Structures are given as structure tokens and as C-alpha cells.
Coordinates of N, CA and C and ligand atoms in Angstrom, one line a residue:
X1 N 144.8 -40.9 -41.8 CA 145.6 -39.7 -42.0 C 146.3 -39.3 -40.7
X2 N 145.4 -39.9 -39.4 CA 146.2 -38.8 -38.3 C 146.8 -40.5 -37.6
X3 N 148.6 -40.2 -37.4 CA 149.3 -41.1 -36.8 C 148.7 -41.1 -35.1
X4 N 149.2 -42.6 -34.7 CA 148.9 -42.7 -33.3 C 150.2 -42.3 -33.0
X5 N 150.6 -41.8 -31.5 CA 151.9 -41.7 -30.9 C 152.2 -42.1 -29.4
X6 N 152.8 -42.7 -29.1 CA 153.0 -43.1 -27.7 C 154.7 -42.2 -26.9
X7 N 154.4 -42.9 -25.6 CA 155.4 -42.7 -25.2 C 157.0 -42.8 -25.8
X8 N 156.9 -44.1 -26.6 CA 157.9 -44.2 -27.0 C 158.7 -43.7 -28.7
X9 N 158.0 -42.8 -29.1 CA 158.4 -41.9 -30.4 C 158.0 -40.7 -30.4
X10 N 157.2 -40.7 -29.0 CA 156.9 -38.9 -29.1 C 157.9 -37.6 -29.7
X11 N 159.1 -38.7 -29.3 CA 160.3 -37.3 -29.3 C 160.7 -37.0 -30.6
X12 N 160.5 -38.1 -31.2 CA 161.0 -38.5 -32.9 C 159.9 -37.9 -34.1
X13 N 158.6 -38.4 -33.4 CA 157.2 -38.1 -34.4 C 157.2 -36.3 -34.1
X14 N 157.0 -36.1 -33.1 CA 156.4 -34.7 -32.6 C 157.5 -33.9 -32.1
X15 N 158.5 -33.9 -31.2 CA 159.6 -33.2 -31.3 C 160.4 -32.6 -32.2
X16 N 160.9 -33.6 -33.3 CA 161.9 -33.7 -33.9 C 161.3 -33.7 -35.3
X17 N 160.2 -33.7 -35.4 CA 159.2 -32.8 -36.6 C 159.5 -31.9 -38.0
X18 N 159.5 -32.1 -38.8 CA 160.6 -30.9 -39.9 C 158.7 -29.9 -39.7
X19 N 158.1 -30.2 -39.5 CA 156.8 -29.0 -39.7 C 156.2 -29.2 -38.2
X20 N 155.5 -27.7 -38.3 CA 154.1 -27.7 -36.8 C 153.7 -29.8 -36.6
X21 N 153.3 -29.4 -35.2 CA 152.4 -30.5 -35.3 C 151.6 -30.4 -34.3
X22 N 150.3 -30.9 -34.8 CA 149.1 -30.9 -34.3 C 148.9 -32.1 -33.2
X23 N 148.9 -31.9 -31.7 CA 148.7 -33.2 -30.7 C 147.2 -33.4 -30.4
X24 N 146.5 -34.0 -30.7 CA 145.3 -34.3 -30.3 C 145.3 -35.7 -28.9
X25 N 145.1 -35.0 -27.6 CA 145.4 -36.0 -27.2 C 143.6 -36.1 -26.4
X26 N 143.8 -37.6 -26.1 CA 142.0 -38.1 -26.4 C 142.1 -39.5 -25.6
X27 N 141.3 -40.1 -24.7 CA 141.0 -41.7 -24.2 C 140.0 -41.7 -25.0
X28 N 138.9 -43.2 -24.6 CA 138.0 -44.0 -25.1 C 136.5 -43.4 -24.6
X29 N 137.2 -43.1 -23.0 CA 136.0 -42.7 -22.0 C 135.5 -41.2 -22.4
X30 N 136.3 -40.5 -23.3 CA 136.4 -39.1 -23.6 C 134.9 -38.6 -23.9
X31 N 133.9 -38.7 -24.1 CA 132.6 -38.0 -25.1 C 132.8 -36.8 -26.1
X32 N 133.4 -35.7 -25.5 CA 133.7 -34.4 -26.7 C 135.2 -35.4 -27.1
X33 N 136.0 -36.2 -26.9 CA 136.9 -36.5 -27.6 C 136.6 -36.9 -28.8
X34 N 135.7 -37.9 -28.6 CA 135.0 -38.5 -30.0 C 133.9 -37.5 -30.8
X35 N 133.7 -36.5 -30.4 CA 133.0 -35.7 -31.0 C 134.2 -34.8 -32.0
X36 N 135.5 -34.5 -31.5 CA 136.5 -33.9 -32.8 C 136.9 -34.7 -33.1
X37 N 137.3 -36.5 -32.9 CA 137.9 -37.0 -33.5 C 138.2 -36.8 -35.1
X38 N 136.8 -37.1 -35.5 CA 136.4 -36.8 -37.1 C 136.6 -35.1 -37.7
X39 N 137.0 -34.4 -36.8 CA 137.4 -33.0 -37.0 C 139.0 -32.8 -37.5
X40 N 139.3 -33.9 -36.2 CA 141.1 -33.4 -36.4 C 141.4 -34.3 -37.5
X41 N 140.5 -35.6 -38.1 CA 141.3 -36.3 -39.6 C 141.0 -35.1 -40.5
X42 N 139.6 -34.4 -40.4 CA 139.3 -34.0 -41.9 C 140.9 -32.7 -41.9
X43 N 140.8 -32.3 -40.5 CA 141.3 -31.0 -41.1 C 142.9 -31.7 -41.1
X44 N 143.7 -32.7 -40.6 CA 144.5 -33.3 -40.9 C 144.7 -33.5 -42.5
X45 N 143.5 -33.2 -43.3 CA 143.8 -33.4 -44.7 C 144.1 -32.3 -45.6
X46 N 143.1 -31.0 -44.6 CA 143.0 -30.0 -45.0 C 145.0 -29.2 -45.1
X47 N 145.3 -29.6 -43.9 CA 146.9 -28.9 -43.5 C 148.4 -30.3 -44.0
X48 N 147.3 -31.1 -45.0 CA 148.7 -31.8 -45.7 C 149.7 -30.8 -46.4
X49 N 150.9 -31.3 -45.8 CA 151.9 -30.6 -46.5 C 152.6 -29.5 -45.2
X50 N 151.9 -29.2 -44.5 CA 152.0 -27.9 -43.5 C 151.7 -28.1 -42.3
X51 N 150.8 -28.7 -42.0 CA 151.0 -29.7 -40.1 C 150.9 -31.1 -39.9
X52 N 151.8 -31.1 -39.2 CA 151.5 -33.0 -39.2 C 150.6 -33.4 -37.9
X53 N 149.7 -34.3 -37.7 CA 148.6 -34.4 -36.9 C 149.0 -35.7 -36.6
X54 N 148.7 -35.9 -35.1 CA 148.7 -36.5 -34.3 C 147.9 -36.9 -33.1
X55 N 147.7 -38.6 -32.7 CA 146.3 -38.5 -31.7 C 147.8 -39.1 -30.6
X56 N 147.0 -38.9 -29.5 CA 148.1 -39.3 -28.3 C 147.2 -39.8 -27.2
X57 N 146.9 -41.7 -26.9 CA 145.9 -41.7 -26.1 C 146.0 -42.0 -24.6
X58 N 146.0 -41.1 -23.7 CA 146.3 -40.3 -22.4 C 146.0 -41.6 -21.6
X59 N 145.5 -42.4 -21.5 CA 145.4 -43.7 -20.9 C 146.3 -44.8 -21.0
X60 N 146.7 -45.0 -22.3 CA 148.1 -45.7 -22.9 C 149.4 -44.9 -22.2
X61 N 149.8 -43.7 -22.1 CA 150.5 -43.1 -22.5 C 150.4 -41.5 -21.5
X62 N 150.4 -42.3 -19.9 CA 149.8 -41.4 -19.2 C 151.3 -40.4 -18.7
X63 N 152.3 -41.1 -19.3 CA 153.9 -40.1 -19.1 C 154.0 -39.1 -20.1
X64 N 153.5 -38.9 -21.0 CA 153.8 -38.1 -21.8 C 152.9 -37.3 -21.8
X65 N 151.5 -37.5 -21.2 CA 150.5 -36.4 -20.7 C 151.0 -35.5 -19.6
X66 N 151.5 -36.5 -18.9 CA 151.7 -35.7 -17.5 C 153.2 -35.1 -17.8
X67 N 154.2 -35.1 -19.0 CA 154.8 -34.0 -19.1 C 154.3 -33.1 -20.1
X68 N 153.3 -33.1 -20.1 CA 152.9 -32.1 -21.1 C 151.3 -31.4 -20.8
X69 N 151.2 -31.5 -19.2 CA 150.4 -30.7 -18.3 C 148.9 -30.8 -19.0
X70 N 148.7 -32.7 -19.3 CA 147.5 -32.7 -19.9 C 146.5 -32.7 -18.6
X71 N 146.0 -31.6 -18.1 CA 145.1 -32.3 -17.0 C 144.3 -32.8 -17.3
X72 N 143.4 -32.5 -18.7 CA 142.1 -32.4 -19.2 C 141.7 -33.2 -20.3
X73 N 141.2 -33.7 -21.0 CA 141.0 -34.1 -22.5 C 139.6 -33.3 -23.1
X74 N 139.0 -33.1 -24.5 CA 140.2 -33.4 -25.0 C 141.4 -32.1 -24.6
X75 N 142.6 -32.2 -25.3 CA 143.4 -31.0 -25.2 C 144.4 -31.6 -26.3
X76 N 144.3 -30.2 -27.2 CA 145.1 -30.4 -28.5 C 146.4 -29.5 -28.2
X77 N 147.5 -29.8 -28.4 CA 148.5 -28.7 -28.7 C 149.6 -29.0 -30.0
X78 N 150.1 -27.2 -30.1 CA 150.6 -27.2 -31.0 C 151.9 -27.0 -31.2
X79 N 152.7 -27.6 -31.2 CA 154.5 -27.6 -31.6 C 154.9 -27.6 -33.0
X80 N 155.8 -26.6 -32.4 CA 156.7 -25.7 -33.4 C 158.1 -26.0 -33.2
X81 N 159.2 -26.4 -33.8 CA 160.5 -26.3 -33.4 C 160.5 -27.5 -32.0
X82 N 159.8 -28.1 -32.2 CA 159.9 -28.9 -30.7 C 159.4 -28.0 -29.5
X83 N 158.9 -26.8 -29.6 CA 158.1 -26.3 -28.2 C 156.5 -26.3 -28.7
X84 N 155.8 -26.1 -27.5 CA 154.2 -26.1 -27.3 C 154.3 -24.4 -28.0
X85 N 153.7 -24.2 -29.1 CA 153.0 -22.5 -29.1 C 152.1 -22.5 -29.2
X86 N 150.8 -23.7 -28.8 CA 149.5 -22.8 -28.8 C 148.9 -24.3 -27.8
X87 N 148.0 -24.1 -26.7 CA 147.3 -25.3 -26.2 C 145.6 -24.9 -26.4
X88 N 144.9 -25.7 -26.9 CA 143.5 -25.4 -27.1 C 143.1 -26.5 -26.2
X89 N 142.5 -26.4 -25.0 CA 141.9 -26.9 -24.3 C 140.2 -26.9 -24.5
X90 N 139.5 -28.2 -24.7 CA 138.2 -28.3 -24.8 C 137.7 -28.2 -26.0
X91 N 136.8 -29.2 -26.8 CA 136.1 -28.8 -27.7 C 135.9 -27.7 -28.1
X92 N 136.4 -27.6 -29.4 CA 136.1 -25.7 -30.0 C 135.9 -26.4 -31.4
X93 N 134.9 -25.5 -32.2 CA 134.5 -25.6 -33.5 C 136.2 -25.4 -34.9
X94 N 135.8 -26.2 -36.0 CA 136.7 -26.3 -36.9 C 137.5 -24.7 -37.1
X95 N 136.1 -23.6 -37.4 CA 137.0 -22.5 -37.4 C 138.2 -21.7 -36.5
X96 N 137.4 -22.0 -35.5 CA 138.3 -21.2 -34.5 C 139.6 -22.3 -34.1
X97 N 139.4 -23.2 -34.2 CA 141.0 -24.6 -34.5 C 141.4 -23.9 -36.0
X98 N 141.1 -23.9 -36.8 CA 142.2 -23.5 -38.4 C 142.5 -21.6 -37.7
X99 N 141.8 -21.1 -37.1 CA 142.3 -19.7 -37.1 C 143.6 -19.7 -36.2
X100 N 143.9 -20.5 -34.9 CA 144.4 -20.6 -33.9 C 145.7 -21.1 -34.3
X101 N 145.4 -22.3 -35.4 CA 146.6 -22.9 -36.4 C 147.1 -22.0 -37.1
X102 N 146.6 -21.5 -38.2 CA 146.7 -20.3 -39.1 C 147.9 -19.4 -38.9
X103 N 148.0 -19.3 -37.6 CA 148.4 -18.2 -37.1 C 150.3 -18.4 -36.7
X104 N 150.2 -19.7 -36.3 CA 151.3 -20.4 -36.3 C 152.2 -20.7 -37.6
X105 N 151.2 -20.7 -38.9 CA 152.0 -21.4 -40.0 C 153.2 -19.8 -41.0
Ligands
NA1 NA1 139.6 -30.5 -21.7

């Protein structure tokens, strides 16, 4: 359910977006990365229709982190219209991710 995105369609997949979209961005070395992975598909199923989700892996794809002030993983953000409106930095529980989204839609 949740597309990979690199450097080279970021602009297309996630910019240029007709809906929100969800960035999950995540490496291999990550530990809490792999601990939401399976968070951000379910609820990727939950916001069909209404967010589009996406993983972005900061090792592949270390230009489009560093323009988008990934210092950290994981670190999810949320674009709207092509801007960032919401950055969730660090593992946080399903709820308080759908409340933070919610709020956006
Ligand atoms: Na982090």
C-alpha cells in the first residue's frame, strides 16, 4: 500500500500530489523505524482515498532528506498543497499520528 519514493519523483509523487501526503522517511539501521513501519501501511489503508503515504529511504536518498531538514529518523511529515504542515519527529503511537493527520484533512 505505502509507495517507495526517491530522489528522483519526489517532486511528482509528493509535491505535485492532488491529496495530503504522508512522508515516512526510515533507513534499514533504523530500530523505532521498523517498529512503525507496519503502522504507517495499516493506517495507509485506513486514509485511502484522503492521504497518500509514502516511505522515503534517507540512505538511498540522502538529497531529499537534507532538503527537507531530516536530521533524525524516523521523521514522518505532512504535505499539503506541496508545503510541509505538520513534521512528527520520533516514534509516536497510532492515535496521536491519526489525531495530528485528522487535523489536516
Ligand atoms: Na527521530
Amino acid at each position: 500500500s505505502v509507495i517507495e519514493v526517491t530522489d528522483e519523483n519526489f517532486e511528482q509523487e509528493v509535491l505535485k500530489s492532488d491529496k495530503p501526503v504522508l512522508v515516512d522517511f526510515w533507513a534499514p539501521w533504523c530500530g523505532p523505524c521498523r517498529m512503525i513501519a507496519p503502522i504507517i501501511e495499516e493506517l495507509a489503508k485506513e486514509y485511502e482515498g484522503k492521504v497518500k503515504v509514502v516511505k522515503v529511504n534517507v540512505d538511498e536518498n540522502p538529497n531529499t532528506a537534507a532538503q527537507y531538514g531530516i536530521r533524525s529518523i524516523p521523521t514522518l511529515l505532512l504535505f499539503k498543497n506541496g508545503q510541509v504542515v505538520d513534521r512528527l519527529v520520533g516514534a509516536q503511537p497510532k492515535e496521536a499520528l491519526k489525531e495530528r493527520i485528522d487535523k489536516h484533512l
